Symmetry: C2
Subunit: 78 residues, 2 copies
């Protein structure tokens, strides 16, 4: 078993490497440990998750920008 | 400026490197030359363009897959 702090560290690593499938699995592993945490640690993990979500939402808007440039190229190839 | 052969080569280089802004620019430069080309070079270019469309469409689909997994991660984060 990995401890909460060790999964927390892999979660941020996954996010940085833009490895979202691995992130998914870590969050699902973390889901088991969530119910037996003290309230202060839980609240800091949830606060941290807001910041994590800000990171991937910026990555998502960048993917949409790159998709759109390919749409321009596609029109220009046609 | 550059001739058609050099542009076509840089175009394939831009596709490989995911440099779609440079592709756009190169395609604009090519569109000026298109009118003057022989019918044989035009058809060569149209054929290449098909394969090129396949490559960037495959890459656009890959990006959407990333977006789709990202949406799942958000859900799992938003509990
Ligand atoms: Ca992975």
């Amino acid at each position: 078993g990995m401890n909460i702090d060790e999964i927390e560290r892999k979660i941020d690593e996954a996010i940085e490497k833009e490895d979202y499938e691995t992130l998914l699995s870590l969050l699902n592993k973390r889901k088991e440990l969530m119910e037996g945490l003290p309230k202060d640690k839980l609240s800091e993990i949830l606060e941290k998750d807001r910041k994590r979500l800000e990171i991937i939402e910026k990555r998502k808007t960048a993917l949409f920008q790159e998709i759109n440039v390919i749409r321009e190229a596609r029109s220009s190839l046609q």
